[PDB]
Amino acid sequence: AWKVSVDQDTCIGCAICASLCPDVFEMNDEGKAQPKVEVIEDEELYNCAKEAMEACPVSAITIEEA
Template sequence: MKVTIDRDTCIGCGVCASICPDVFEIDDEGKAKALVAETDLECAKEAAESCPTGSITVE
C-alpha cells in the first residue's frame, strides 16, 4: 500500500503516529511524515481513517 500525506492540510495532531508508529511520525515542523513510502501494515489504514483532517491516503 502506498502512503501519502497532504502536509498542507495536516494539523500535526499525532493520531497517526500513535496508531502506527512504524509508518508515521511528527517531524520538526509539527507535521506528520511517512517513514516509509509503502507498507503492508494494516495500522496505516486505521491511521488514515482516524486522521481528523483526512490528510492521509493509503492506496
C-alpha cells in the same frame, strides 16, 4: 504494495496517526506527520495505516495501491 501520503498543507500535527501506527508515521520538523516508510508490503502495517487514515481528524492521509 501500498504507498502512504500525508498532505502537509492539511495535517494539523495531532499525532493520532503516529500514536496508532508508530512504524508507519513520524513527526517532522514542521510538526506535521509524514510516512516513515516509502512502501508497505506487510499486511499488519497496511492495516494500521488504513486505521490511521480513517481516524485522521482532517483527512490528510491517503494510501495508494499498485
